[PDB]
Design a protein around this ligand. Sequence first.
Ligand SMILES: O=c1[nH]cc(-c2cc(-c3cc(Cl)cc(OCCC(F)(F)F)c3)c(=O)n(-c3cccnc3)c2)c(=O)[nH]1
Ligand SMILES: O=c1[nH]cc(-c2cc(-c3cc(Cl)cc(OCCC(F)(F)F)c3)c(=O)n(-c3cccnc3)c2)c(=O)[nH]1
Lengths: 303, 303
Amino acid sequence: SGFRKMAFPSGKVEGCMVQVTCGTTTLNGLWLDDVVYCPRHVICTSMLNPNYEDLLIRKSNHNFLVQAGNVQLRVIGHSMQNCVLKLKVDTANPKTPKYKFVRIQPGQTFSVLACYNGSPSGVYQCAMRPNFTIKGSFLNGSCGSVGFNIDYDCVSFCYMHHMELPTGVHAGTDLEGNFYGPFVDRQTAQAAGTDTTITVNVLAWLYAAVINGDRWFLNRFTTTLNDFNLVAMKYNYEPLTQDHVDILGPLSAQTGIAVLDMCASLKELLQNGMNGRTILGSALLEDEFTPFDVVRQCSGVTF
Amino acid sequence: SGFRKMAFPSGKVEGCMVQVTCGTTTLNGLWLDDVVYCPRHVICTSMLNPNYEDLLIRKSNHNFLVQAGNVQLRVIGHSMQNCVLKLKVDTANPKTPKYKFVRIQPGQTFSVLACYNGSPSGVYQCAMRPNFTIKGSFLNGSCGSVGFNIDYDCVSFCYMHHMELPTGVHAGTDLEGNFYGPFVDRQTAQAAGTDTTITVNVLAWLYAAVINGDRWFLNRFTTTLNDFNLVAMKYNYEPLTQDHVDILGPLSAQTGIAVLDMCASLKELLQNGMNGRTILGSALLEDEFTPFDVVRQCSGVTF
Ligand SMILES: O=c1[nH]cc(-c2cc(-c3cc(Cl)cc(OCCC(F)(F)F)c3)c(=O)n(-c3cccnc3)c2)c(=O)[nH]1
Ligand SMILES: O=c1[nH]cc(-c2cc(-c3cc(Cl)cc(OCCC(F)(F)F)c3)c(=O)n(-c3cccnc3)c2)c(=O)[nH]1
């Protein structure tokens, strides 16, 4: 029993984190096989309208200092792919895990290994918000920290950290260096779009609550998908789709509560609040657990 | 910016987790140097009044199957210390970190690496509640999972998981096998004592909120320690001590808000609620961050 914001074990990623210095700028990089991936804004000084092709043309391999733990790695090549810098090094990472690069959809969750000067600091879970930001915990020097999922023993990297927006939320790229969202890696007026709540995740979390013995919010009613989405839109919730309903199938089956039955509970909670009760220790509706996250944690899968 | 329930990177612990089988009972063990530590109830069948000295007298080394990843470890000795079984094995763990065993005080936090069949599943943060339980996330097979902190590169183990209580909370021991709280490792009528909120942690978390730009709960008032503890007791909060005030010193200094000034904020929040506002994304007062946790995460320390 119990339900917690659970990250994946981070050891496989910790062995990949290095420090990348270029001039006076230091940040983190990801060392897989003989390549080190890091944000390209490492080659910047100050930055309002940087021309990165020019900035990189003016660099040489010896302008890049890469340290893995205590050993310095020799850079033997450098190139840029979108907003990521790729530094070829002379030695392949002996700790390289089985891995893949993936570009996730909004509403999906991942583990973040926050790092400073190439040294892991902590691990936490978060979600790609519908507005393509993440509500992380990042200080100066955290750029290059990665987000990931782990299936079987394969690490799927899905996020590298680049920037903190003025509202305190965070922007980054997939590991091919494509930003999530409309953002660009320069100092300009940038702001996240309006955000919405991830409906399918809230429902998943209600199922986890039921699985853990919180039932007070259940009712006998049912709603139509169309009637529910009318209420969703009113409270700034993402529309619920038949894909979402099918994804919730196994949780619906394990609890015996039909998805559209749970939607009637969610409607009431949106309309009437919680009246001083809590769900899974929260006074607010939680939306950073996917259906997969719930099944994993209430079923016990390992990696 | 940002504030998240952050666990320590778990790699150093992942390399220590093994599976320990005795008959039909399988659980996790912790492999440090040439010893494997696990809950002694692994040698039980069913268990209401087990006599563990007798149960262990009847065992031999070959009744214990220890698997580390894919390799089976040869048990060459066995003994019991309090509620922990210690199995001497023929091979010292080559991945043993620098480590220590520590017995923590209630209100202190730690990272939990949940494991099944010796394989890490996830990592999360929690606190030793004042009633010596933890609100973890554990399923059958999780016994033997450990809780830990990491300072510099030294892993301080402070919890091994033994049991789930009927209320869904969790009971365990230090790594010397002494239970936290009044619990015993047998099937009987056991229930946690009444719990209280960790006042010093709530104040620490209010400081983190201020550090991250949430100020709406601040006021111009101040309170006496005595007057505050009168309100604390009313709302089932632990008394605040001068030790607690001194521990909050650095957060008080960094924000310029005196501790007793923050206590007046907390008093108002206890009396008047939040009136539909949130702090650090929470509608409830959070009490599982220590002052040290706040400083670490709002200052950027690594391990
Ligand atoms: O030496 C070092 N110098 C600099 C950094 C650094 C650099 C940026 C950065 C980079 C770019 Cl290209 C654009 C940018 O714009 C702001 C957002 C908006 F522009 F979109 F509005 C910001 C940055 O956000 N952080 C940072 C701080 C706190 C949390 N998370 C990231 C750090 C470093 O880590 N080390
Ligand atoms: O093969 C396996 N058999 C058994 C287990 C197992 C065994 C116990 C256990 C052990 C003892 Cl000694 C006493 C006990 O009493 C209950 C609490 C109270 F008694 F204090 F009220 C319970 C246990 O709680 N869990 C468990 C489940 C879910 C979450 N966390 C722990 C598992 C196993 O993991 N594998």
